[PDB]
């Protein structure tokens, strides 16, 4: 009993039902069952499709956009136990986006060993709360019953009831003839026999004889050698939370993919290693990393969006190739780097084609091996076409790279100098590989500025809010070509990193200060700034006069008076003690040297009893009259010795306790 | 009086002794040493009318012009430098106008630049004098670098349309223009509308006077002089008009130089090249046929001269060499060639072309090819950066000229030409809501449906009907009975909300004439 016919694995079927007839003599699914993507199937396609022989699906049952399917009692009129060995989003019944699915027909769904139930976007689905999941599941707290027809209450869900044990004051039923196997309170979850005695402490759902670990129908946690056991000891290993396996189970399944070659950690037979590990393949005890090799399916993958990019998050090595047509997306090169900038190695080729809106590929700093095992056709390990806005491969003085095979398809990418190619020819080390118009020279680097020189500051003056600058007047041969000066400030105290200024009067040069000028006005004090200017010159129809550009400078703001000492709270916890507490100023503007506390009695230049609070955010004020009105003044300071730079007052008051 | 040209000294300036009317231009410049005292002792206020234009350039000392010619009244605008009857340029000391008596620029505009001392602008209107007010470019002045309290010096009715008014405001004679010394009097006009003859304003020449240079009336003897003094333009007589040349298809008479029709006009180019840029270039070869050489064009304007282009334009249909156009931004059509059927391309546009096209952005029409044919003897076609001319007309022009087998890969820029179509898919099913729109719409299928890439639904809100989503292609494989009407659900809609919505189709270009595809109609859908 419990194993009549065939023991089959899982099945995934799409767009036709010539293949679902294979579950006729299949009594067991050792896996899951997903019927998906059938917009052409009809209710006639599932009425003459009935499988009472198929009993247990170990992982889950999934349905996904099958038009026409209406009920599972038409398909599988005896679906009872889903052990949940594998779970989709921690669900053992995933009913997702089912059009035409009118009911479950799960009048005999009795047990789930592990998991929950996913019922989403099923616009026709009823019989969901009536087939009560609390009697099936250990944990209904994790269920997903949303966006259904049972949710928006229009289902005419009728029970068969228009000696079952009872817990309103109401019992629960499954069919007209199927009472639930209901066990008493002392039989917690192990199930019980026909007369009602509690089984061993390792059973689940049902057992055949009570108080015996060899007689369960399902096990609670574990099982070994004709007996639901408490744990899996060595030289055996844990496996899949319903049994124990030995070493030769784990060793040989590691060797049959010669794919999740089985490994061992914490006396288990796990498919792959846990975190930070690179196995010893011999003993397979989850060895520590000495790394994420992402073999792509059929050696390739096309990435064109951030959603297509999040799929390979955290990869390092690619045992395959990539295709790239990324033309847009929000938070590009940041979502793209956290997913894919981590990638170090590529076995196959690389393809980029028509990837429009991207400007710099510097964020793939890891990508330093290309094996070129799969080759882009034309004897290339590389493809770049129509990649329009691209202006940086890398700082090749920064980024080194190994490309093992193949040539380089450089075509129609009009915004890159040949020097970056000649960088990449040099630094990746493939300069002698590429044939005739692998590099289409005239289709690249013809629609971007090439300001070959540097803008340099003849004068710099700073303040806390103001930075006055004078720098080099660049002049093209015909000076009419100069159209502007393009100061691109951005705030950066880090040095690991937008204003346009018109051309000045050319007009002369015996002694002509046409050094152009900029003063800033709204700047944060004590604050450093990635600022970089560029000459705006005219692209001639001929060789454009290139221009200059300033370097990314980093100029910190001056240190001025600090901000308000935040939240002055004066608490009179005694007749003589007052605890004054506060927060640091939001603008230190210079390193906060100390704080200043004054205090002053309210009646009922001169010295007040004072306190310089050095690098502390609290103060107890002692030596005070009982129950007397005080006025307390608080200041902060970011300069201490020379003629101090200090904050404004933060007034507060407190009256001590009486006697 | 003819057009005069004075530089480097004030010597030739007192030759203006008695000129009441200029029939010509004026170009006086390069006078830095001249002083404001050098112009106070200087005036020739006899002058009333100029035909062509004026040049003004870097004459120092010069401050105002009401002293010199307070009585200058009309620029006819008969020759326009870059469509300007005036450019005032780099004029130091030049402070004000006082020139109320100028009345009509009949033709042209004024470009004002670098006249760093200029005031007195705002209280005077342009539509009064200039027929076209838009083409003025007024920049780089004292009033521009804002310092001038522009008043009139003093601080005609609309029925006096072109004839203008006298001193009391009465409309002048039909052949007056602008002003009359006595109201409605051709004799006592200040200026003539059409012709001047014998102290009077007439419209035509009474015989034997020829309609000579469109403002006067000279007898046979006078034009007969103009021929023989060149023994320079020896003039000819045709259609009661003494003129310099006979137009195309014409043959002179030995007796009276009548431009008789030929029994079957060679505008032989200087250097075999006219590089073409301007109105000033446009007046030159009006009405030609034979272009004995090649032509280069750069006109990046925007004030589209397209009509007055076509006035002094192509009655040509022949080019002995190639053709060149680069960066001619402004124009949209090329239909304005009245005869054009042949280019030889024997001189090759380099790249062995008959032709050069670059950065010609607004161009949408070559021709109605059914009407206007095309023949190219030698050469290929340089077609580049012309984002409003489709490859269809290109492949037509390949075919109408018949030179489709001559051109090579990216002689025609395959991308930047026409990137800024025949079918229109229709919404075969429409569902709406207060918050949703579900649609099914007609299936487009190219023959090679490997090339099919997507459906591009442009949508935006538009309560006005004064008017961005890709949607996937469905599965072809066959379509006898398939709802390959693809579906997409609008989801984020507000109740009672109006959109402009239209689909467009996305395919892959095969190197043939492009299998086009569809848009959809700009539909307007309101929610609830």
């Amino acid at each position: 009993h419990l194993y009549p016919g065939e023991v089959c694995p899982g099945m995934d079927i799409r767009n036709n039902l010539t293949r679902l007839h294979e579950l006729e003599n299949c009594s067991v699914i050792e896996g899951h069952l997903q019927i998906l993507l059938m917009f052409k199937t009809r209710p006639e396609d599932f009425r003459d499709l009935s499988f009472p022989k198929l009993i247990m699906i170990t992982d889950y049952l999934l349905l996904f956009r099958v038009y026409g399917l209406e009920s599972l009692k038409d398909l599988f009129p005896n679906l009872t136990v889903i052990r949940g060995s594998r779970l989709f989003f921690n669900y053992a019944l995933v009913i997702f986006e089912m059009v035409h699915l009118k009911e479950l027909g799960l009048y005999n769904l009795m047990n789930i060993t592990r998991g929950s139930v996913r019922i989403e976007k099923n616009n026709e689905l009823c019989y969901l709360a009536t087939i009560d999941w609390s009697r099936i599941l250990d944990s209904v707290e994790d269920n997903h019953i949303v966006l259904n027809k049972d949710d928006n209450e229009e289902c005419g869900d009728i029970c068969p009831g228009t000696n079952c044990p009872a817990t309103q004051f109401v019992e629960r039923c499954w069919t007209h003839s199927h009472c639930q196997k209901v066990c008493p309170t002392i039989c917690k979850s192990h199930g019980c026999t026909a007369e009602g005695l509690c089984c061993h402490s390792e059973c689940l759902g049902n057992c055949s004889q009570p108080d015996d670990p060899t007689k369960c129908v399902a096990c609670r946690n574990f099982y070994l050698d004709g007996r639901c056991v408490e744990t899996c000891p060595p030289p055996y290993y844990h496996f899949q939370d319903w049994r124990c396996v030995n070493f030769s189970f784990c060793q040989d399944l590691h060797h049959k993919c010669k794919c999740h070659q089985y490994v061992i950690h914490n006396n288990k037979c796990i498919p792959e290693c846990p975190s930070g590990y690179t196995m010893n393949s011999s003993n397979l005890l989850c060895t520590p990393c000495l790394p994420k090799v992402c073999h792509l399916l059929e050696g390739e993958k096309t990435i064109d969006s951030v959603t297509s990019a999040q799929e390979l998050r955290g990869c390092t090595v690619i045992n395959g190739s990539l295709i790239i047509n990324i033309r847009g997306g929000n938070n590009l090169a940041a979502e793209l780097e956290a997913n894919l900038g981590l990638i170090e190695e590529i076995s196959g080729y690389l393809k980029i084609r028509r990837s429009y809106a991207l400007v710099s590929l510097s964020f793939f700093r890891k990508l330093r091996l290309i094996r070129g095992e799969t080759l882009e056709i034309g004897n290339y390990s590389f493809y770049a076409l129509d990649n329009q806005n691209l202006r940086q491969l890398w700082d090749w003085s920064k980024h080194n790279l190994t490309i093992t095979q193949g040539k380089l398809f450089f075509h129609y990418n009009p915004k890159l100098c040949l020097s970056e190619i000649h960088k990449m020819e040099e630094v990746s080390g493939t300069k002698g590989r590429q044939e005739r118009n692998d590099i289409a020279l005239k289709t690249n680097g013809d629609q971007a500025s090439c300001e070959n020189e540097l803008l340099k500051f003849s004068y710099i003056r700073t303040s806390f809010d103001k930075i006055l600058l004078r720098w080099e007047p660049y002049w093209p041969p015909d000076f009419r070509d100069l159209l502007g000066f393009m100061l691109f400030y951005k705030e950066a105290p880090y040095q690991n990193v937008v204003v346009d200024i018109d051309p000045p009067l050319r007009s002369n040069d015996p002694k002509s200060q046409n050094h152009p000028g900029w003063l800033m006005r709204g700047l944060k004090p004590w604050t450093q700034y990635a600022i970089f200017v560029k000459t705006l010159v005219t692209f001639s129809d001929e060789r454009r006069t290139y221009g200059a550009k300033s370097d990314i400078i980093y100029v910190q703001t001056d240190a001025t008076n600090p901000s308000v000492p935040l939240d002055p709270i004066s608490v009179s916890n005694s007749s003589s003690q007052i605890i004054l507490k506060w927060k640091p100023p939001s603008d230190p503007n210079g390193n906060i040297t100390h704080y200043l506390v004054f205090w002053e009695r309210q009646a009922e230049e001169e010295h007040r009893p004072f306190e310089k609070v050095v690098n502390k955010e609290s103060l107890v004020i002692s030596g005070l009259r009982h129950f007397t009105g005080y006025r307390i003044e608080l200041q902060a300071c970011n300069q201490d010795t020379p003629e101090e730079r200090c904050s404004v007052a933060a007034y507060v008051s407190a009256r001590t306790m009486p006697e | 009086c003819p057009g005069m040209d004075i530089r480097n000294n004030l010597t030739r300036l007192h030759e203006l002794e008695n000129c009441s009317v200029i029939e010509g231009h004026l170009q006086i410049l390069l006078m830095f040493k001249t002083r404001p005292e050098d112009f106070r002792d200087l005036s020739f206020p006899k002058l009333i009318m100029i035909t062509d234009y004026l040049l003004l350039f870097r004459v120092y000392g010069l401050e105002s012009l009401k002293d010199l010619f307070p009585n200058l009244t009309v620029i006819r605008g008969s020759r326009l430098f870059f469509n300007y009857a005036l450019v005032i340029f780099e004029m130091v000391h030049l402070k004000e106008l006082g020139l109320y008596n100028l009345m009509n620029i009949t033709r042209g505009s004024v470009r004002i630049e670098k006249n760093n001392e200029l005031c007195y602008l705002a209280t005077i209107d342009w539509s009064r004098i200039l027929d076209s007010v838009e083409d003025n470019h007024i920049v780089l002045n004292k009033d521009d670098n804002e310092e001038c309290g522009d008043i009139c010096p003093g601080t005609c009715p609309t029925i006096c349309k072109s004839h203008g008014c006298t001193a009391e405001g009465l409309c002048c004679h039909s052949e007056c223009l602008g002003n009359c010394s006595q109201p409605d009097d051709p004799t006592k006009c200040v200026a003539c509308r059409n012709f001047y003859l014998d102290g009077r304003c007439v419209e035509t020449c009474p015989p034997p006077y020829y309609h000579f240079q469109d403002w006067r009336c000279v007898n046979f003897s006078f034009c007969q002089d103009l021929h023989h003094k060149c023994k320079c333009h020896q003039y000819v007589i045709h259609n009661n008009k003494c003129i310099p040349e006979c137009p195309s298809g014409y043959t002179m008479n030995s007796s009276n130089l009548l431009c008789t029709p030929c029994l079957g006009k060679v505008c032989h180019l200087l250097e075999g090249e006219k590089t073409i840029d301007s109105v000033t270039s446009a007046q030159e070869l009006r009405g030609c046929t034979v272009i004995n050489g090649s032509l280069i064009i750069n006109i990046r304007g925007g004030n589209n001269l397209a009509a007055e282009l076509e006035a002094n334009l192509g009655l040509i249909e022949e080019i002995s060499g190639y053709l060149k156009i680069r960066r001619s931004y402004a124009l949209v059509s090329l239909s304005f060639f009245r005869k054009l059927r042949l280019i030889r391309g024997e001189t090759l546009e380099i790249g062995n072309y008959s032709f050069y096209a670059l950065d010609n952005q607004n161009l949408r029409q070559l021709w109605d090819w059914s009407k206007h044919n095309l023949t190219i003897t030698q050469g290929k076609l340089f077609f580049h950066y012309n984002p409003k001319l489709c490859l269809s007309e290109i492949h037509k022009m390949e075919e109408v000229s018949g030179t489709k087998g001559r051109q090579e890969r990216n002689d025609i820029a395959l991308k930047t030409n026409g990137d800024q179509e025949n079918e229109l898919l229709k919404f075969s099913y429409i569902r709406t809501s207060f918050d949703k729109i579900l649609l099914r719409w007609e299936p487009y299928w190219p023959p090679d449906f490997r090339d099919l890439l997507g459906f591009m639904l442009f949508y935006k809100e538009a309560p006005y009907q004064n008017v961005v989503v890709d949607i996937d292609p469905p599965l072809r494989s066959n379509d006898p009975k398939s709802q390959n009407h693809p579906g997409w659900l609008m989801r984020g809609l507000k109740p009672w909300t109006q959109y402009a919505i239209f689909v467009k189709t996305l395919v892959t270009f095969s190197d043939e004439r492009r299998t086009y595809g569809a848009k959809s109609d700009i539909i307007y859908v309101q929610t609830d």
Binding site: P477, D478, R480, S507 | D5, R7, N8, Q27, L30, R58
Partner: peptide, 30 residues
């Protein structure tokens, strides 16, 4: 020579220097 691209006023007052105060002749039919 002022080994510079004489453009506009740099070209202009060079010519007023070099052509001088005769300047040159701009005489159309002379």
């Amino acid at each position: 020579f002022v080994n510079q691209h004489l453009c506009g006023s740099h070209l202009v007052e060079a010519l007023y220097l070099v052509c001088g105060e005769r300047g040159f002749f701009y005489t159309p039919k002379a």
